[PDB]
Structure formats: structure tokens, C-alpha cells
Design a protein around this ligand. Sequence first.
Ligand SMILES: CCCCCCCC/C=C\CCCCCCCC(=O)SCCNC(=O)CCNC(=O)[C@H](O)C(C)(C)COP(=O)(O)OP(=O)(O)OC[C@H]1O[C@@H](n2cnc3c(N)ncnc32)[C@H](O)[C@@H]1OP(=O)(O)O
Ligand SMILES: CCCCCCCC/C=C\CCCCCCCC(=O)OCC(COC(=O)CCCCCCC/C=C\CCCCCCCC)OC(=O)CCCCCCC/C=C\CCCCCCCC
Ligand SMILES: CC(C)(COP(=O)(O)OP(=O)(O)OC[C@H]1O[C@@H](n2cnc3c(N)ncnc32)[C@H](O)[C@@H]1OP(=O)(O)O)[C@@H](O)C(=O)NCCC(=O)NCCS
Ligand SMILES: CCCCCCCC/C=C\CCCCCCCC(=O)OC[C@H](CO)OC(=O)CCCCCCC/C=C\CCCCCCCC
Ligand SMILES: CCCCCCCC/C=C\CCCCCCCC(=O)OC[C@H](CO)OC(=O)CCCCCCC/C=C\CCCCCCCC
Ligand SMILES: CCCCCCCC/C=C\CCCCCCCC(=O)OC[C@H](CO)OC(=O)CCCCCCC/C=C\CCCCCCCC
Ligand SMILES: CCCCCCCC/C=C\CCCCCCCC(=O)OC[C@H](CO)OC(=O)CCCCCCC/C=C\CCCCCCCC
Ligand SMILES: CCCCCCCCCCCCCCCC(=O)OC[C@H](COP(=O)(O)O)OC(=O)CCCCCCCCCCCCCCC
Ligand SMILES: CCCCCCCCCCCCCCCC(=O)OC[C@H](COP(=O)(O)O)OC(=O)CCCCCCCCCCCCCCC
Ligand SMILES: CCCCCCCC/C=C\CCCCCCCC(=O)O
Ligand SMILES: CCCCCCCC/C=C\CCCCCCCC(=O)O
Ligand SMILES: CCCCCCCC/C=C\CCCCCCCC(=O)O
Ligand SMILES: CCCCCCCC/C=C\CCCCCCCC(=O)O
Ligand SMILES: CCCCCCCC/C=C\CCCCCCCC(=O)O
Ligand SMILES: CCCCCCCC/C=C\CCCCCCCC(=O)O
Ligand SMILES: CCCCCCCC/C=C\CCCCCCCC(=O)O
Ligand SMILES: CCCCCCCC/C=C\CCCCCCCC(=O)O
Ligand SMILES: CCCCCCCC/C=C\CCCCCCCC(=O)O
Lengths: 421, 420
Amino acid sequence: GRGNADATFTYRPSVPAHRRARESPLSSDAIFKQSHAGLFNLCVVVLIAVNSRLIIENLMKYGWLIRTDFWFSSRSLRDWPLFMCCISLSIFPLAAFTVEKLVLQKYISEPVVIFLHIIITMTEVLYPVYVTLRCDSAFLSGVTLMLLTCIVWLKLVSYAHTSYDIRSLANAADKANPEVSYYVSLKSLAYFMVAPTLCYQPSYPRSACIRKGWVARQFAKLVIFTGFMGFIIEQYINPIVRNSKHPLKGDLLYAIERVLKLSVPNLYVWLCMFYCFFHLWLNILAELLCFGDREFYKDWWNAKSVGDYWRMWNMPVHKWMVRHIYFPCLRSKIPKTLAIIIAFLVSAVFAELCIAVPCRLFKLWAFLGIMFQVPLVFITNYLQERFGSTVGNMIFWFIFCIFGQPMCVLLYYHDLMNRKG
Amino acid sequence: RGNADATFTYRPSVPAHRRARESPLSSDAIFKQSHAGLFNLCVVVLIAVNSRLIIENLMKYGWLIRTDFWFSSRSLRDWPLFMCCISLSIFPLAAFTVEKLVLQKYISEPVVIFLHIIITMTEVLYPVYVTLRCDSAFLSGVTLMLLTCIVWLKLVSYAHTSYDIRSLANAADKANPEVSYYVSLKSLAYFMVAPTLCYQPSYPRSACIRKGWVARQFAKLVIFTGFMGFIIEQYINPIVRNSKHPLKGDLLYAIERVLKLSVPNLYVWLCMFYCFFHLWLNILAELLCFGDREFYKDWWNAKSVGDYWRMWNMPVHKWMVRHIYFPCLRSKIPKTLAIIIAFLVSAVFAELCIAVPCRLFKLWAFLGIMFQVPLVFITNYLQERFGSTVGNMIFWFIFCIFGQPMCVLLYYHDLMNRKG
Ligand SMILES: CCCCCCCC/C=C\CCCCCCCC(=O)SCCNC(=O)CCNC(=O)[C@H](O)C(C)(C)COP(=O)(O)OP(=O)(O)OC[C@H]1O[C@@H](n2cnc3c(N)ncnc32)[C@H](O)[C@@H]1OP(=O)(O)O
Ligand SMILES: CCCCCCCC/C=C\CCCCCCCC(=O)OCC(COC(=O)CCCCCCC/C=C\CCCCCCCC)OC(=O)CCCCCCC/C=C\CCCCCCCC
Ligand SMILES: CC(C)(COP(=O)(O)OP(=O)(O)OC[C@H]1O[C@@H](n2cnc3c(N)ncnc32)[C@H](O)[C@@H]1OP(=O)(O)O)[C@@H](O)C(=O)NCCC(=O)NCCS
Ligand SMILES: CCCCCCCC/C=C\CCCCCCCC(=O)OC[C@H](CO)OC(=O)CCCCCCC/C=C\CCCCCCCC
Ligand SMILES: CCCCCCCC/C=C\CCCCCCCC(=O)OC[C@H](CO)OC(=O)CCCCCCC/C=C\CCCCCCCC
Ligand SMILES: CCCCCCCC/C=C\CCCCCCCC(=O)OC[C@H](CO)OC(=O)CCCCCCC/C=C\CCCCCCCC
Ligand SMILES: CCCCCCCC/C=C\CCCCCCCC(=O)OC[C@H](CO)OC(=O)CCCCCCC/C=C\CCCCCCCC
Ligand SMILES: CCCCCCCCCCCCCCCC(=O)OC[C@H](COP(=O)(O)O)OC(=O)CCCCCCCCCCCCCCC
Ligand SMILES: CCCCCCCCCCCCCCCC(=O)OC[C@H](COP(=O)(O)O)OC(=O)CCCCCCCCCCCCCCC
Ligand SMILES: CCCCCCCC/C=C\CCCCCCCC(=O)O
Ligand SMILES: CCCCCCCC/C=C\CCCCCCCC(=O)O
Ligand SMILES: CCCCCCCC/C=C\CCCCCCCC(=O)O
Ligand SMILES: CCCCCCCC/C=C\CCCCCCCC(=O)O
Ligand SMILES: CCCCCCCC/C=C\CCCCCCCC(=O)O
Ligand SMILES: CCCCCCCC/C=C\CCCCCCCC(=O)O
Ligand SMILES: CCCCCCCC/C=C\CCCCCCCC(=O)O
Ligand SMILES: CCCCCCCC/C=C\CCCCCCCC(=O)O
Ligand SMILES: CCCCCCCC/C=C\CCCCCCCC(=O)O
């Protein structure tokens, strides 16, 4: 035919076929200086075949498990006592604003301000916890209420500390510009409480305008990916978790097989959760509010260790811990390792709150898992220095996406089922 | 930052937002740097999936390895076949006798083609009758039929190359070399055991024989052959035993069985290539001091099916180019019919190798080799349309996930259907 090789002018069989002594491939170091694209294309083809076999085997065993009443039903008893609390979480920054105005005119002293701030933040933590504990609602409503409570707590602590620092620099060094209009101050606080950031500033860099078609397109992608995530949770995660036993009570091999079976759709749900929250929703929120800065994350998938992942997975939380926990501890002559223990302790307490308060279980799995990250940072740093970056990134994937999250899902689900009966 | 080290402390009055930036996935300037974490994620998911398959098979079945699966009461199969493998040696000596009988001007030139036809058909038909008469295992008859194909390719190559040298020497009318009978017999004897299919009076030679190198390659050959036996016994056998015919049951069940079987089948095929085409041929070339050792190329980077067929097996490719392609081109046969002739020879010999030990007459392997001609024409077009990556992926999907497990299931269930 056409031919993608040497020309077709005939040489006779009396002409020899062997004239030079060569050497076979994979028997010399010259094979390493060549691109082997097919060896990764083979892995991609094997992955597609494996996932296709899993889909066909799950469909043959179970069938269509999708129901119209699984996610959103007519049980609206969960809605009204907690969503009202969601609106009732907006009275705590205004109270804080009143305290700040009380120190702006010379009416009260500084320790009274710190004591009042502790009262407002503590009441803000304790009241939704009591509301969620007294009622009986779904998991999702409680998770949403706890996440909003944690975000409002971080904003209040950041606003109070940054306002004290601005007041302390404006009173000590040089006194200028006294008594700025209450409406501009209320507008800045109200703008900060809805913006996609956790650090308070009086003003922020802005963008051009609102692109309505862009916001509509990102919203359409967000609803499609959320529906895809719900389908993967209902059709694939639910059979595996119903058909298991407790991992700490039973055979070891059976528990390892259940964790390895749960590892793949959990990883898919994790990537979809990151793309839905940290990319789509924050950009839609920034576009509506004309928020200029949009560095909400970095390339965390190229992490060379556990500490690399914790440095680049979440930009607002990392900037909040650097500004409000790490640097005040460093200024007070405390060592570095104590600062990493205090920061991970704050993270472990709030993660334990968000997971355990809807579940109504005092099992400290999530607390121990966040608190175990402190020796893991040093161990993966030593391993990455000794062995390289590829082996460090593989150790990070094995620890995070293969072992930890399915084990947490199985422990919390089975503890909840043992609580109910 | 990088490892563990602090930074001086700033203050919260300093703003943390001073520039208006965009997200990493909001721009097309994201592929400039290396995203090595995705490749590592694919490797980690593959290792986890393989470990789950090993643990699930071990929990379901247990240890299935037996001490008498391969070598147990083999004297009924070893005595007639291995003797027939020694009996194949008289077929070069006949052809050599015919060459000497035309070299001394005792018989004419049309008689030698007829005599070569009698020698080649007798050499093919005698092991077929010996394999079909006395009952034996599959692995003892596969070896005999593969030596029946290799000795037929060497005899056809020797006859054609000898005729071409004689036809060249006839038109010159001068003969200064005078090769003795011992030297010609030594050349033919060296050709029959060398790792090549193309006849030459002499070849480039190697320096010497390295004993430690031969011992190391032989040790690797024993370890990898044992690994192949363990994969076939422990994993391929329970999948193949608990299944049905692919055109008898439900379609979803058949697709699930082929996709289940396709993962250890790939390991057996790559291990088979590494054991034969790399280890054994180099050991044979080292013991025989054979210089040329390019027995293959990098076929795993092929962008189409025709690319794979061009670089999977160097002796068979040189034999098809020298003995089937260029004589067809010299005789004004069209270029699209020589491909059909070459694939026809390969399909007949492949169908013979799978069907004579199995004792079945079903053309699964024959039609599979003969379907590669429209596959070559389609994949060249898809390669030109969509690129080398898509072409290589189509090659991997067609060969490793669909063709070979379906062929294994069809031949097994047809064999079990015959035996009852
Ligand atoms: C719609 C799809 C649906 C799904 C799919 C359904 C069907 C699936 C079916 C099945 C899947 C599985 C398939 C098998 C898997 C296992 C394989 C094994 O390893 S098992 C061992 C058994 N195999 C054998 O017994 C064969 C042995 N035969 C050969 O290896 C030969 O080499 C053969 C017949 C393949 C001939 O091919 P050449 O490439 O070696 O040689 P030439 O035909 O002479 O030339 C081809 C090309 O060579 C170049 N060429 C031409 N002249 C050249 C020259 N002088 N020098 C170099 N190259 C030259 C040109 O590119 C030419 O192109 P131009 O085909 O005409 O388009
Ligand atoms: C809601 C409204 C909020 C607005 C608030 C106002 C301003 C915002 C303010 C400030 C900026 C915010 C940033 C600050 C903090 C936030 C980040 C945060 O806190 O969490 C984020 C995320 C994280 O979840 C994870 O699990 C990942 C954790 C990482 C892995 C950890 C585990 C592994 C560890 C160890 C391994 C174990 C090894 C041990 C030993 C081994 C042996 C050695 O959770 C979600 O929220 C995702 C939810 C899922 C997606 C739902 C849909 C998403 C779309 C929309 C929702 C709204 C749509 C409205 C549409 C209306 C019309 C329809
Ligand atoms: C706590 C968190 C900030 C991680 O950071 P951390 O290591 O604990 O503490 P810091 O942010 O103060 O320091 C991070 C690193 O940056 C380094 N660093 C120091 N100064 C820095 C600076 N100016 N900028 C950036 N990094 C800096 C630190 O040395 C540290 O490396 P180290 O850990 O070896 O000390 C945060 O990303 C986190 O872990 N959150 C968890 C939230 C969570 O678990 N929620 C539930 C999930 S389901
Ligand atoms: C990333 C790699 C995988 C991507 C490839 C996905 C395609 C592979 C193929 C095939 C499925 C083949 C079966 C076709 C469906 C009809 C079978 C039938 O006639 O039976 C009747 C029965 C009666 O009920 O069913 C139905 O009507 C059909 C309902 C089921 C459709 C589900 C399709 C969703 C597929 C993929 C989702 C993507 C996420 C992957 C998650 C993987 C987790 C393990
Ligand atoms: C650390 C990185 C590797 C990541 C792979 C995931 C490993 C998960 C599994 C298992 C460890 C199992 C060994 C613990 C033994 C104690 C359990 C017990 O008490 O009972 C023993 C039981 C008798 O009842 O069984 C046995 O005696 C031996 C069990 C053998 C199973 C080993 C298979 C899984 C481990 C590794 C596979 C790695 C190869 C993958 C290569 C793929 C390349 C693409
Ligand atoms: C005894 C007198 C008779 C006359 C002389 C006999 C010698 C004739 C032959 C041969 C030397 C071979 C030279 C030709 C090179 C081209 C080979 C070829 O073109 O054939 C390719 C083949 C079929 O197409 O491709 C395959 O896939 C084969 C897959 C087999 C993999 C099985 C793993 C074990 C590998 C090798 C056997 C172990 C060595 C023996 C050691 C044990 C000693 C008792
Ligand atoms: C002169 C000597 C010749 C040497 C020839 C052979 C050398 C290499 C050989 C063989 C295979 C051995 C590898 C396994 C190690 C022995 C296991 C053992 O100690 O004895 C079994 C014991 C009772 O005796 O207990 C058990 O059964 C539990 C252990 C089973 C472990 C299986 C590990 C499989 C590893 C990789 C397979 C990768 C393929 C995955 C494909 C999945 C597709 C479905
Ligand atoms: C009991 C928990 C309290 C939670 C927080 C309460 C509200 C905080 C509001 C702060 C407002 C400014 C106050 C005065 C600032 C000052 O004098 O000056 C600023 C100082 C540090 O002074 P320097 O900057 O001079 O070193 O800030 C701090 O000491 C803390 C800053 C805010 C971060 C609080 C984080 C809370 C969680 C702590 C770890 C976990 C709990 C540990 C105990 C069990
Ligand atoms: C149109 C249909 C053609 C046949 C199709 C089926 C072919 C099956 C495979 C066998 C033939 C392979 C090629 C052999 C010929 C060649 O290389 O070459 C055939 C040659 C080529 O001559 P040129 O080089 O001058 O073109 O034709 C000749 O007349 C020269 C004399 C050759 C004498 C020795 C031939 C080989 C002897 C042993 C095998 C005999 C035939 C067995 C047939 C079953
Ligand atoms: C079904 C009870 C809750 C199960 C645990 C859920 C834990 C939170 C994780 C993901 C839930 C949010 C993403 C999926 C929502 C899909 C909604 C929908 O498809 O309509
Ligand atoms: C409403 C009736 C059914 C209730 C049980 C629903 C299933 C609960 C089981 C598992 C939920 C898993 C939630 C998502 C896990 C991934 C989270 C992550 O990766 O961070
Ligand atoms: C023999 C050892 C048994 C170990 C039992 C406990 C295993 C670890 C359980 C949970 C680890 C933490 C889970 C992931 C981090 C916390 C939860 C989260 O934020 O998603
Ligand atoms: C009202 C209860 C109905 C039944 C339970 C439905 C809720 C599912 C609850 C817990 C499952 C998941 C908890 C563990 C989450 C860990 C997140 C992660 O994987 O990182
Ligand atoms: C069709 C395949 C071609 C032939 C390949 C098989 C060769 C068989 C020879 C030896 C296999 C021995 C199997 C050893 C199993 C593992 C033993 C062990 O683990 O102790
Ligand atoms: C029936 C006797 C006992 C069972 C013996 C084994 C049965 C399995 C049958 C066929 C599987 C052959 C596996 C290897 C074939 C080559 C794979 C390949 O070409 O890629
Ligand atoms: C010692 C050799 C072992 C070989 C094991 C092979 C397993 C598969 C069995 C039969 C497939 C035969 C394929 C024949 C290919 C072409 C033969 C040829 O033309 O030389
Ligand atoms: C899409 C369904 C198509 C069904 C087709 C059924 C026909 C099966 C024919 C060929 C299958 C594979 C045979 C080729 C592999 C050859 C192996 C070898 O040469 O040794
Ligand atoms: C008494 C002996 C009974 C039979 C022994 C075991 C036979 C296994 C043989 C045949 C099944 C097919 C083998 C592989 C052929 C297809 C090769 C391929 O597709 O590449």
C-alpha cells in the first residue's frame, strides 16, 4: 500500500540480511534516553478496562439503585429550626461591631474588649451546637450549619485581632483621621462577612464588572458535577458500605479488601468535591461581589510530602493560620513545633465538631487523624529528602487517598449504626 | 516551606490581598509546568486495584498451586514426540543432497523445485499425523508444531537463496571458489540452529562466550518461566474454569469475563515476549557466537497495527520481505495482494499450531490473523486523522483487552465441548 517505511525496490535473496553485529534493546543504557509513551498509554487502557468491569459487575449484582427521595424529600422538619439559626448567626458580627465602636470612642478599656470578644465567639460556638444536639435532623443540614459556624468564627477572630492591631498602631505611633462614618465601617464588615476570604481588610482589590453569561455557565457546570457526585455516592459507595462489618472487629484481610474497594469512588468524590467548592463556587461568589483576588488554591496534586499538601490545599485557611496563630506565637518566643501543634489542634477541634455533632458520637477518629499529621510531616520530609520527589508523591497518595478517608467513612458509619441499635 | 524553617513575623495591618489574580484552572497557561502527580496517581490506583484482586482471589479460592500440574506421568507424551523432534533432522540432509545433485550437473533445474516441494510437504505432513494419532498434552504438541514451522521456514529460505546464488553463478561462467562438501554441511548445520530464518553462507561473529552472563540469563529465564506458571495456575485457571461460551450466554456476562481475564493475560504475554525474544535468543546467540542480535524493536511505541507488525519479530519480518514480498513485486503482482499472501501463510501456520494439539477444526485464529488487513487500512487512516497517542490506544484496546482473552475462551470452551 502506501507504506510508512523503507522503499520497495527489490533486492535479491543472495544479498545478505546480516552485515553488522548489533545488540538487542533492553540490554544497554541507550534505551533509557528515549521516550516511551506506550507504557503510560497501556496503564490508561488497563484503568478504563478495570473501571468498565467494576461498573458492569456492580450493575449485574445490584441494578439501578437511584431513588427520587434519597437526597431531597418532603421531610422538611430538618429545614426550619436550623436555617433560622443560619439567619440567627448574623447577629454576632453586629454585636462585635458595637464593642469596636465602644472602644473607638473612649468609653471602655482594652481587657473588657478581649473578655467581650471571648464571650461573643464562645456563644457563637455553643448555641448552634445546642440547636443541632437538641433536634433530630439529617446529616447534610448539620454539616452545612457546622461549616457556616466555623467560617463565621474564623472571620470574627480575624476581624477582632486585625482591628486591635490597626487600633494599636493608630493610637501609639501617630494619631490621625478620627471617627470614620458608621455606614462605611458597617459596609466593610458586611462585605467581609460574605467575601471568599478569611482575613479582614478595610478595602480589597476589585475587578472590572460582573459577566452574567460566565456566572450562568459556571453555575450550570456546578449543578452537573454535583448531580454526578450524588449519582456516584448513591450507586457505588452505598452498596460497599452496607455490605461490610467493623474494620477493628473481624478478619484483617476482609477489612483490607473493603477499604481497597471503597478507595476508588471515594477518590472520585474527593476530586469532584474540590472542583465543586474550591474552583466553581468561590469564583461565582468572587464574580458576584467583584472580588479581585482569586488565588483560592495552588497545584496541590504535585505535592512532594504531607506538609507540601497542607501548605497548598487551601489558601484562605493557610493565610489565616500564618497571620493569626503562627506569627503571634513566634513573636512571644514560643518554638516552631509548638505552633504546628496549636494550629493542628485548632484544625482537629473544628473538624471533630463538624463531623461528630451531626453524628452524635464521641469517637475521636477525625481528631486523632488531624493530630497525627504532626509526626507525619517530619517522617515524609525525611523520606522525601532521602528518596526523591516521585516516591514522596506516591507515599502522599497512598496515605491520603487509599488508606485514611475510606477507613474514616467505615468507622464513622459503623459506629453510627451501632449507636442506633 | 520546603522542609521546616520559619520566617520573620509581619503584622495583620499589612494586607494579604494586593493584586488581582486568577485561579490555576481558569487559564490555558497551566500545562507549561510538569503535572507529575497525575501519573503517580494512576500508578497508585493500579497497585491498589491489583492488590484487591490478589486478596479477593486468595479469599475466594485459596492456594491452588499443585506439584503435579505440569510434569506428572509424562512418559506417554514424551517418547513419540521428542523422537519425532529428532526425526525432523533428515529433512535438511535430503535438501542438501538435492543441492549437491544439481551442483555436479546430474539432474536438471525444473526437477529441483519438484523435489523441494516433496521435501517441504513431507516435512509438514509427518508431525501432523504423529500428533493426531497418539494422544498427548497440549504443551508437548505446541513445541513440536512450532519446530515444524521453524524448520519449514529455514528449508524454503535455504532453497530459494541457493537457487538465486546458482542463477547468479550460471550467467557469469566463472567459478573461482571451490567449496568442499564438509564446509557446505557445516554452513547448513550452523544455519539450522542459529537464531535467524534467512540463509547465508557466513555471518558476522562474536568475540567469545561469557559463562557468567549465560548463567545469569538462564537463571532469569528459570525465575520468569516459574512466574508465568504461577500466574496461569493461580489466576487464569479459576477465571477460565468458572465461565461459559462467549456466544451462548448474556452479552454483559461475556464482556465481564473477557475484561476479568484481560489483566493476567497481559502479564503472561509480556512475560512470554521477555522469555523468548530476549532471554533465550541471546543465550542461543552467545553459545553459537552469533554477531547480529536485533531480534525485535520497540513495538510498544507503535502508532498503528501495521507499525506493530513491522517491528514485533525481526527474523519473520526479514523472511516475509525477502521471500514473499519482493518475488511477488518482481512478478508484477499488485502491492495489495502480497499482504494477503503473507498474512495467509501466517494465518495457516498459526491456525495449524493452535488446532493440531487441540484436535479442533475451528478457524478462530485463522480469521483473526486474516482480519488484520482491513484493520491495517483502518488504523493507518485513524492514525493520520487523530494522532499517534489515539492510534497506540486503539492498538492496545484491540490487542490486549478484546482479541487474546476471547480467543482463549473460544478455544477452551470448544475443547471442553469436544471432550464432554
Ligand atoms: C473493528 C475492530 C474490531 C475489533 C478487532 C476484531 C479482531 C481482533 C483480532 C485479533 C486481535 C489479536 C491479534 C493477535 C495478537 C497476538 C499476536 C502474537 O504475537 S501471536 C503470534 C501469531 N502471529 C503470527 O503468526 C504472524 C506472524 N507474521 C508476521 O509477523 C509478519 O511480519 C506479517 C504477516 C505480519 C507481515 O507484516 P510485516 O509488517 O512484517 O511485512 P510486509 O507485509 O511485508 O510489509 C508491511 C509494511 O512493511 C513496510 N515495507 C515494505 N517494504 C519494506 C522494506 N523493504 N523494508 C522495510 N519495510 C518495508 C511497509 O510499511 C508495508 O506497508 P503495507 O502493509 O504494504 O501498507
Ligand atoms: C456553603 C456556603 C459557604 C459560603 C460561606 C460565605 C463566604 C465563604 C468564606 C471564606 C472562604 C472559604 C474557605 C475557608 C474554609 C472552607 C474550606 C473547608 O473548610 O472545607 C472544604 C471542603 C473540605 O472537605 C474535605 O473533606 C477535604 C479535606 C482534605 C482531606 C482531609 C483528609 C485526609 C487526611 C489525612 C489522611 C489520613 C492519614 C492518617 C494516618 C495514616 C497512616 C500514617 O468541604 C466542603 O465544604 C465541600 C462541600 C462538598 C461540595 C458541595 C457542593 C459545593 C458547591 C457549593 C456549596 C454552596 C452552594 C450554594 C448554591 C446555592 C444555589 C444552589
Ligand atoms: C494548619 C494549616 C495552615 C497547615 O499549616 P501548618 O503547617 O499547620 O502551619 P503554618 O500555616 O503556620 O505553616 C505551614 C508551613 O509554612 C511555613 N511557613 C512559614 N512562614 C511562611 C510564610 N510566610 N508563608 C508560607 N509558609 C510559611 C512553615 O514553616 C510551615 O512549614 P512547617 O510545617 O514545616 O513549619 C492548614 O492548611 C491546615 O492544616 N488546615 C487543616 C484544616 C482541616 O484539617 N480541616 C478539615 C479537613 S477535612
Ligand atoms: C473512567 C473509566 C470509565 C469510563 C467508561 C464508562 C463506559 C464503560 C461501559 C459500560 C456499561 C455497559 C452496560 C450498559 C447499560 C445497559 C445494560 C442493560 O441493558 O441492563 C438493563 C438494566 C436494567 O436495570 O440496566 C439499565 O437499564 C442501565 C442502567 C445503568 C447505567 C449506568 C451507566 C453509568 C456509567 C458510568 C458512570 C461514570 C462513573 C464511574 C464510577 C465507577 C465506580 C466503580
Ligand atoms: C506498602 C505499599 C504497597 C501497597 C499495596 C497495598 C497493600 C494492601 C495489603 C496487604 C498486606 C497483607 C499482608 C499481611 C498479612 C497478615 C494478615 C493475616 O493475619 O492473615 C494472613 C493470611 C492467612 O489467612 O494470608 C497470608 O498468609 C498472606 C496474605 C498475602 C496477601 C498479599 C497481597 C497484598 C500485598 C501486596 C501486593 C503488591 C503487588 C502489586 C503489584 C502490582 C503492579 C502493577
Ligand atoms: C533436533 C534436530 C532438528 C533440526 C534442528 C532443530 C533446531 C530448529 C530451531 C530453532 C532455533 C530458533 C531460531 C528461529 C528464531 C525465530 C523464532 C520464531 O520466529 O518464533 C516466534 C514464536 C512463534 O512465532 O513466537 C512466540 O510467541 C513464542 C513464545 C514462547 C514463549 C514460552 C516461554 C519459554 C521460552 C523459550 C523456551 C525455553 C528454552 C528451552 C530450554 C529448555 C531445554 C530443555
Ligand atoms: C530453582 C527454583 C526455580 C524458581 C522458579 C520460581 C521462582 C519465582 C516464583 C513464583 C511465585 C511465588 C510468589 C508468591 C510467594 C509464595 C507464597 C507463599 O508463601 O506460599 C503460599 C502460602 C501457603 O504455602 O499461603 C498463601 O496462599 C498466601 C500467599 C499468596 C501470595 C500471592 C502473591 C501474588 C503476587 C503477585 C501477583 C501479581 C498478579 C495480579 C493479577 C491479578 C488479576 C486477577
Ligand atoms: C478560649 C478560646 C478563645 C478563642 C478566641 C477568642 C477571641 C479572640 C479575639 C482576639 C482579639 C484581640 C485580643 C488581643 C490581642 C493581643 O493582645 O495582641 C495580639 C496577640 C499576640 O501579641 P503579639 O502580636 O504582640 O505577640 O494575639 C494573641 O495572643 C491571639 C490572637 C488571635 C488568635 C486566637 C486563636 C484562638 C485559639 C487559640 C488556640 C487554641 C485554644 C488554646 C486555649 C485552650
Ligand atoms: C498466486 C498464488 C501463489 C501461491 C500462494 C500460496 C503460497 C504459500 C507459501 C509457499 C510459497 C512461498 C514462496 C516460495 C517461492 C519463492 O520464494 O520464490 C519464487 C521464485 C521467485 O523468482 P524471482 O526471484 O525470479 O521472482 O520463483 C521461481 O520460479 C524461482 C525458483 C524457485 C525455486 C525454489 C522455490 C522454493 C522451494 C520450496 C517451497 C516450494 C513451494 C511450496 C508451496 C506450498
Ligand atoms: C445521604 C446522607 C448523607 C451521606 C453523607 C454525605 C456526606 C457529605 C458529602 C457529600 C454530599 C454533598 C454532595 C452530594 C450532594 C448531591 C445532591 C444531589 O445530587 O441532589
Ligand atoms: C439516607 C439513607 C442512606 C444513608 C447512608 C448513606 C451513605 C453513607 C456512606 C458514605 C458517605 C460517604 C460520603 C463521601 C465520602 C467522601 C468524602 C471525602 O472524600 O472527603
Ligand atoms: C491498628 C490501627 C487501627 C487504626 C484505627 C484508626 C485509623 C484512622 C482513622 C481515621 C484517620 C483520620 C481520617 C481522615 C482525617 C480526619 C477526618 C477528615 O478530616 O476527613
Ligand atoms: C441520620 C443518619 C442517617 C444515616 C447516615 C447518613 C450519614 C453518613 C454519615 C457518616 C459517613 C461519613 C463520615 C466520615 C466522613 C469522612 C470524610 C472523608 O472521607 O474524609
Ligand atoms: C502456555 C504457557 C507456556 C509455558 C509456561 C509455563 C511453564 C511451566 C513450568 C514451570 C511452572 C512452575 C510453577 C511454579 C508455581 C509456584 C511455585 C511456588 O510458589 O512454590
Ligand atoms: C484442561 C487442563 C488443565 C487446565 C490447563 C489450563 C487451562 C487454561 C487454558 C488456556 C489459558 C492459556 C493461558 C496463556 C495463553 C497465552 C496468552 C497470550 O497469548 O497472551
Ligand atoms: C515452549 C513454547 C511454549 C509456547 C506456549 C504458547 C501458548 C499459546 C499456544 C499456542 C499459540 C501458538 C501461536 C502460533 C504462532 C505462530 C507460530 C509460527 O508461525 O511460528
Ligand atoms: C464484537 C464481537 C465480535 C465477535 C468476533 C468473534 C470471532 C473471534 C475471532 C477472533 C478472535 C481473536 C483471534 C485472534 C488472536 C490470534 C492469536 C494467535 O495468533 O495466536
Ligand atoms: C489432556 C490435555 C487437555 C488440554 C490441556 C490444556 C489446554 C489449554 C489449551 C487451549 C486453550 C487455548 C490456549 C491459548 C490459545 C490462544 C492464544 C492467543 O490468543 O494468543
